[PDB]
Design a protein around this ligand. Structure first.
Ligand SMILES: [Zn+2]
Ligand SMILES: [Zn+2]
Ligand SMILES: [Zn+2]
Lengths: 96, 291, 291
């Protein structure tokens, strides 16, 4: 469904303790030794919220990776109750 | 408004602007401060070294006494004064290329007070404390200037500077809102300051007879972060600040409280220290350092 | 969009300029539509009278038949074509001095329909009727274009078209809003026209044997309001129109109904008329209207 681009050979290399804050929202190239893995966890990618007041499920809304979007109002029927997720129709992504 | 704060701020501006002294036998009379302004501009640094004796000689020490005794209130006034000084002389480095948060790191204070000698009256004042670095934290970003997105009348508004407690803008880009429901921060537009909490022990020589080494937690911000070494004797200069404490609720003695519908907040604190200047107490490098 | 609508609109605006009826011996030939446009600019009126005979003459009357059979469908195209023609020649009168509504009135239809001749297959078409005015109502405003105040991000959307029924602006003054649940209308940015309902009645000479008189409700929109006193025989020219009726709930015959959820709605209507204009049938003004 989607494609990704993997940048390589960035000029500047910073150690972990030298990140400070100027490198915020910036591309960095750091090196280290891996310590802990958290396994492979599915993460919501194309979540389809359902509207039980409408009758059926709503459209697939792209889930921003910063935070979990919510259906406060249904733009169609103004439903405050149903904003749940159906794990069958939802398309997930890997996460570690 | 406060007349005294503004008057002291402008007096500080004037004293900095007209600072004069003979420089040794060579360099004649050098405005060391005004010239060092552009000296640090060359590297676009963020620290301004205010030696205490300079501030102390002028106005028979009244300016130094005012700054030391009530540093917490005066510090923003001094920041505005420094910005005005940059505006008048050497305005080429003000922009970050928003504006660099220049650090005023005082030093060469008269006396250094031990951890055991910390007192509750001198909070809000400027002093130096000497101790041993035992535990240091990570360089975690601290929210200083934030960008808030209003739940209502949605938009992006920056320059809502963060205070010690959380602060959100009451005025909105669309004024009809005047509501503060879910003002949302954003990564790309908010401004942050480097932060570090270092734990220090009391030095062995200054330990009282039959007592344990009293400890203290010191906050490091700006370019002074990640300077101390665990087990390295260091001196810290700055202001004593109080931080909320949720542990000392069951201790004996009455507790501070408020009433405003109970309208009551359990008020307890523990004393910490916000520091500005910290120092540690190829053969060419060592040779260069060698006199 | 529709290709046929574009074709009819471009032909309309084409012959608003290219048409020119002869003046016989006295006056050679002149652009009658352009002459009427100059008259419009001179008197700053708001309605243009177009003879149907000329349209029938032009292009073997195919366009005349098309506009007579489906007047309602092509009406916005007619308005757009007239606006572009006005822009071409004498565009000064385009604006009110926000925007001035131009009214198109067709006169001298080939045939005259009596009130009893109303048929469903003529609904939405152009025709003429002749009746006697019985009841006239007050000249009241109607929402030509309607503006509203937003619910979330409270603000006013400006100059949105209002259809035959209540409408909600899909777009918002704040593009990020996209909320339309609660709109609060503002009269300032809402256009209006003149509305007046006249109840005409069938003339005596047209009544069949035994039938009691039949009557129709005619709506006069525009400058034609209060143009006829009660008890006068007038000729009405306009478009056959339908209006929803809730009274015919128990009548024989299956009631058309729409299902959507449920989305139930009874589709019961009664026939009315929307007349473009009305024609009735000191000594100086009197002396003028004589040969
Ligand atoms: Zn819904
Ligand atoms: Zn707001
Ligand atoms: Zn809105």
């Amino acid at each position: 469904s989607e494609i990704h681009v993997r940048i390589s050979d960035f000029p500047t290399i910073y150690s972990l303790r030298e990140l400070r804050e100027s490198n915020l929202s910036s591309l960095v190239r750091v090196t280290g030794v891996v310590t802990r893995r958290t396994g492979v966890f599915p993460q919501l990618k194309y979540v389809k919220f359902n509207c039980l007041k409408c009758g059926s499920i709503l459209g697939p809304f792209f889930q921003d990776s910063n935070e979990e979007i919510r259906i406060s109002f249904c733009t169609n029927c103004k439903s405050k109750g149903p904003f749940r997720v159906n794990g069958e129709k939802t398309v997930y992504r890997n996460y570690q | 408004d406060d007349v005294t704060g503004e008057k002291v701020r402008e007096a500080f501006e004037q004293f900095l602007e007209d600072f004069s002294v003979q420089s040794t036998d060579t360099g004649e009379v050098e405005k060391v401060y005004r010239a060092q302004i552009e000296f640090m501009k060359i590297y676009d640094l963020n620290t301004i070294y205010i030696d205490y004796q300079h501030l102390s000689m002028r106005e028979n020490g009244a300016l130094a006494m005012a700054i030391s005794e009530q540093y917490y209130r005066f510090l923003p006034f001094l920041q505005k004064g420094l910005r005005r000084v940059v505006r008048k002389y050497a305005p080429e480095l003000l922009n970050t290329s928003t504006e660099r948060v220049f650090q005023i790191s005082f030093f060469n204070l008269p006396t250094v007070h031990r951890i055991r000698d910390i007192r509750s009256e001198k909070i809000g004042s400027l002093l130096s404390i000497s101790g041993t670095v035992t535990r240091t934290s990570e360089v975690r970003p601290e929210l200083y200037k934030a960008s808030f997105t209003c739940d209502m009348c949605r938009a992006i508004v920056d320059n809502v500077e963060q205070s010690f407690k959380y602060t959100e803008p009451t005025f909105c880009p669309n004024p009809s809102c005047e509501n503060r429901a879910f003002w949302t921060l954003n990564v790309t537009r908010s401004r942050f300051l480097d932060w570090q909490k270092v734990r220090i022990q009391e030095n062995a020589n200054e330990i009282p007879t039959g007592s344990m080494p009293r400890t203290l937690d010191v906050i490091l911000r700006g370019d002074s972060v990640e300077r101390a070494k665990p087990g390295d004797r260091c001196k810290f200069t700055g202001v004593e600040i109080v931080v909320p404490d949720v542990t000392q609720l069951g201790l004996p003695g009455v507790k501070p409280s408020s009433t405003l519908s109970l309208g009551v907040r359990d008020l307890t604190y523990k004393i910490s220290f916000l520091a500005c200047h910290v120092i540690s107490i190829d053969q060419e490098v060592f040779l260069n350092s060698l006199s």
